[PDB]
Write a protein that binds this ligand. Structure first.
Ligand code: OGA
Ligand code: MG
Ligand code: NI
Ligand code: ZN
Length: 331
């Protein structure tokens, strides 16, 4: 078995190997990358996502989200408070203000210590889930707006044509902006490209150990657990690496820098935080190996998780028994 300790693998494809996306994902998996739940892909030196980032300040963040925490330093939840619209230019200025900027620090490790110590006492503002793309239309390789669609993958594997579309999303982050512990909708893969700015630190639990994370989460968030059998779908719970180590949960950590891709694999729980002003682009995708995960994915039916139009058809075809109850939670 390849990668039996489930370590995060880092890949360095040649320009030749960067031509065929599907084939490279399949290569990574042949080397055991999926066991970790997350992989890093450094693009060939000749590759670029676009010529410059000089003209992005007029992008609108229609609903910036202030991330308000409750709980203790290592075990907390966050809620999102809606703020007034601002442009990317305005957001970058805010990120760099004395109130929100990254603090002095020695290295990534010191910054990580400071995040876990202090996150709960601040409320950073995140520009999340903005439909759109920063890839140049002439970038032919690993262009997240030109991937094969999940709907076409399900059609090719299962023979059923379904409605729905699949487009990327932009994330504008600042110091301490946080992504809570989750897997993707329908336990899909995701791919994330850090276009610019400061890094993003990731934590991941191997897919083979996801249920251990879920059990710990039920113990640490006992009211949430009673309210919904899949409350991590709400994307609000944070658990520190110290707490995970104390409870014997297997996980790994890695820092992503500007110009690098991360891939999350089906049922790989992940969480993390941004180091300072940055812009990431991400999209879900599928492969033939995903189908069985899709069929088994948990769902939130309490009504909190509230998801896209396109997830309907996935639930309808892959999880017909669940479909009825899950749509009640959607409506
Ligand atoms: O970048 C973020 O805030 C969160 N991204 C993801 O969870 C992802 O790409 O799967
Ligand atoms: Mg602009
Ligand atoms: Ni994710
Ligand atoms: Zn729920």
């Amino acid at each position: 078995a390849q990668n039996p300790n489930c370590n995060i693998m880092i890949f360095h494809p040649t320009k030749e190997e960067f031509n065929d996306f599907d084939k490279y994902i399949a290569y990574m998996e042949s080397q055991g990358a999926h066991r970790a739940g997350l992989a890093k892909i450094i693009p060939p030196k000749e590759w670029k996502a676009r010529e410059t980032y000089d003209n992005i300040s007029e992008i609108l963040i229609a609903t910036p989200l202030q991330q308000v925490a409750s709980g203790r330093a290592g075990v907390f939840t966050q809620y999102h408070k809606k703020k007034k619209a601002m442009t990317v230019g305005e957001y970058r200025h805010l990120a760099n203000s004395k109130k929100y900027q990254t603090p002095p620090h020695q290295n990534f490790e010191d910054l990580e210590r400071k995040y876990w110590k202090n996150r709960i006492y601040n409320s950073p503002i995140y520009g999340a889930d903005i439909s759109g793309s920063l890839f140049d239309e002439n970038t032919k390789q690993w262009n997240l707006g030109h991937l094969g669609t999940i709907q076409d993958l399900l059609e090719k594997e299962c023979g059923v044509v379904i409605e729905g579309v699949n487009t990327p999303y932009l994330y504008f982050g600042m110091w301490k902006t946080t992504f809570a512990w989750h897997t993707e909708d329908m336990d899909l893969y995701s791919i994330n490209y850090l276009h610019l700015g400061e890094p993003k630190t990731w934590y991941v639990v191997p897919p083979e150990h996801g249920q251990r994370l879920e059990r710990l989460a039920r113990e640490l968030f006992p009211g949430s657990s009673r309210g919904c059998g899949a409350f991590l779908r709400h994307k609000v719970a944070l658990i520190s690496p110290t707490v995970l180590k104390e409870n014997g949960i297997p996980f790994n950590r890695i820092t992503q820098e500007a110009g690098e891709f991360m891939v999350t694999f089906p049922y790989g729980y992940h969480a993390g935080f941004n180091h300072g002003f940055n812009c990431a682009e991400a999209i879900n995708f599928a492969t033939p190996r995903w189908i069985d995960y899709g069929k088994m994915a948990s769902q939130c039916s309490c009504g909190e998780a509230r998801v896209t139009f396109s997830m309907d058809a996935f639930v309808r075809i892959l999880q017909p028994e669940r479909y009825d109850l899950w749509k009640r939670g959607q409506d």
